[PDB]
Ligand binder design. Structure first.
Ligand SMILES: Cc1cc2nc3c(=O)[nH]c(=O)nc-3n(C[C@H](O)[C@H](O)[C@H](O)CO)c2cc1C
Ligand SMILES: Cc1cc2nc3c(=O)[nH]c(=O)nc-3n(C[C@H](O)[C@H](O)[C@H](O)CO)c2cc1C
Lengths: 147, 147
């Protein structure tokens, strides 16, 4: 099948995460398209894809603010072709903050409001994702078995 | 009890195996509903059934491919009501191929991932099922004790 991976990454963590999940789907036969959210246009972005995975980090001094490159996509989520789409979300964060991986919850909530089909609960990585490689590959294997 | 048998059969071998099982269960007092996958709709197919038996043959030039009539169902297995359902698989194939009854493995795996309860290891027949009538009968007897 074809999978789209769109990520907003500032420090390289979410990018590394996206890339580890990309390699696992490609190994299972998927044709994978991995894109930085800074370079995509929301209008019809998901058309033609069997599975869409969205990843983003959480920022903000008081509230949950999504990663800067992802904000425009989030704000135009209704024009992407999400209704009825198989999607799953991922993000890196730090459990010391009150809303750990709060960007995953905000994206999952909006996607459910748009009628997307959430295939698996969001992968939330605390600290260095390189330390959690195993959880990352494990979650990729689970989203694949479900669809 | 009520059992549903859904099979994808091209040459008649998976069909004959489905029919032999159906008679064994009917003989043990079950109400059996046997259907060709070509005539079924996936939405809620398993509702109201105590036991669901899925049979499929394996094709494909180099990859393992499901029998054509079963493909649509397999692709929509998440809408059948498999979660918590007691199921078991069966299929005909040929040991000269690299993935002997590979469709049986693919279907068990997906059911597992959907939270179905696999009640007995799948029945894999090499060659003419007419020649393995005893294994068929013995397996149908074994699924009866497990439910
Ligand atoms: C100002 C600021 C706010 C952050 N807010 C959060 C947060 O709300 N939840 C979270 O999981 N991580 C938060 N982080 C961690 C951030 O997503 C990132 O994971 C690390 O700073 C880079 O590894 C924050 C970091 C900064 C600098
Ligand atoms: C082109 C082709 C591919 C087949 N692939 C398989 C396979 O991968 N595994 C298997 O057990 N049988 C395979 N079979 C046998 C097939 O499922 C079938 O059992 C017999 O032709 C009748 O059941 C194949 C048959 C054909 C013609």
């Amino acid at each position: 099948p074809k999978a789209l991976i769109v990520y907003g990454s500032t420090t390289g963590n979410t990018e590394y995460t996206a890339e580890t999940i990309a390699r696992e789907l490609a190994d299972a036969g998927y044709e994978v398209d991995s894109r930085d959210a800074a370079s995509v246009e929301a209008g019809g972005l998901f058309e033609g894809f069997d599975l869409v995975l969205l990843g983003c980090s959480t920022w903000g001094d008081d509230s949950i603010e999504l990663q800067d490159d992802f904000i425009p996509l989030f704000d135009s989520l209704e024009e992407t072709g999400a209704q009825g789409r198989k999607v799953a979300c991922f993000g890196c964060g730090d459990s010391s903050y009150e809303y750990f991986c709060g960007a995953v919850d905000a994206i999952e909530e909006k996607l459910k409001n748009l009628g997307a089909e959430i295939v698996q609960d969001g992968l939330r990585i605390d600290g260095d994702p390189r330390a959690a490689r195993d959880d990352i590959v494990g979650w990729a294997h689970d989203v694949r078995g479900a669809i």
